[PDB]
Amino acid sequence: GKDLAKMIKEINDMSNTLSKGSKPDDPLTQIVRVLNGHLAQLQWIDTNAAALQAKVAAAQK
């Protein structure tokens, strides 16, 4: 897990530095990150909501 985390971190570093590397304190990577967060959370919402929706079909007996 630790090594995998290290890997992911490095991948993030390479992607972020490659896409932009003359202003790492910029608002773009900011929007990217926050927006990714929102994507993930939205996915969570969608999936779990779908699960609950599925759970209702059981009561439809």
Partner: protein
């Protein structure tokens, strides 16, 4: 510097990225020709403007 370099690095052969210079040149040449032919049309019109007087 090395931190950002490793963060923004991509797992791929290096000789392929430098090759992209060829593509970029092929895509710049078009605009360069368009600038040639526009500065040429311009020049022509200018010489006509100096012919009429």
């Amino acid at each position: 510097d090395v931190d950002t370099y490793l963060s923004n690095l991509q797992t791929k052969t290096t000789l392929s990225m430098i090759a992209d210079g060829l593509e970029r040149s092929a895509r710049d040449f078009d605009a360069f020709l368009e600038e040639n032919v526009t500065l040429e049309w311009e020049a022509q019109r200018k010489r006509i403007y100096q012919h009429f007087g």
